[model samples]
Target: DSDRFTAFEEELLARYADKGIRSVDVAAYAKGIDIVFVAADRKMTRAEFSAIASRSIRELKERFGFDKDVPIGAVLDYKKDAATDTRTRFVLKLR
Candidate 1:
């Protein structure tokens, strides 16, 4: 969110190496999606929220060395069963 986490970001970089994603180009991508679950409980349109979620997933995958061959994809189709804490998600593959 803010311009911090530079050192911790290296840990993310190393994680990709551990997963063998040296070919993955993290720098090539510029957009970052930051979502706060608390804030997410309201306001933004479904599309806007989805975009952020997808980007967040992509960021993690890239850090874990998932790219190109894995590509990226997401889908949101679920029942709205309310609970204390609930989550519905899509998938991203690194082939």
Candidate 2:
């Protein structure tokens, strides 16, 4: 709920809603405990792609109750080609 998050966090979540991507749809665990990996696919401007990536990180942090003071680690893979569509993969977890 927004009550558990800050104004900035809420705003980021809103961006995800506006973009039609759900937080549930973006979250997953790759391997190991607490290692969350999230991805989003779309043909969007770089700014939009990055915003979604940031949103994913924030959502993961909130869900896991990660302290903001702790490092929030993430790796982003942005892929595209003439014959293929754009895809953004975000690997997020605490460092």
Candidate 3:
């Protein structure tokens, strides 16, 4: 299952296909996944930016990599304007 984690990647990419998302550099961890959302020139919106993160993490959850049925938390919540300020964190809804 770990080797097939592109499922998450596919969703992550498809979620923002039209939003001018360029590429994401991602890492899979034993307990979690690390992902970077990057795009150029276009300023990203939180509504679109942070939205795919939850679903992407949910894809991880589908791989049975988490402890619960619902998403405990999502690690990063990114906003736009690119380059250095790429990482923002958002926890998933517990309910």
lDDT of each: 0.38, 0.47, 0.54
Candidate 2 segments exceeding 4 Å error: 1-42, 78-95
TM-score of 3: 0.51
Model 1 spans > 4 angstroms off: 1-46, 82-95
TM-scores of the candidates in the order shown: 0.32, 0.36, 0.51
Question: How would you encode candidate 2's per-residue C-alpha lDDT over 1-95 as one tens digit per residue?
Answer: 63433454455545555554433333224432232222244434556655555666666677767666656554444333345654546454445
Q: lDDT tens string, model 1, 1-95?
A: 44343443454435433322121122222333222222212234567546644665566565656554544443232222344343433323221
**Tens digit per residue, CA lDDT, model 3, 1-95:** 55465655666766775765656545654554455555543455556556666666566666756656332333344445644565544433432
Provide the RMSD of all predictions against the true structure, rounded to 1 decimal: 13.2, 7.8, 4.9
Residue pairs with backbone atoms closer than 3 Å in model 1 (clashes): 70-93, 70-94, 70-95
How many residue pairs clash in model 3?
Answer: 2
| Ten-residue region with minimum lDDT total, candidate 2 | 30-39
Candidate 2: C-alpha lDDT: 0.47
10 residues in a row with least lDDT, candidate 1: 19-28
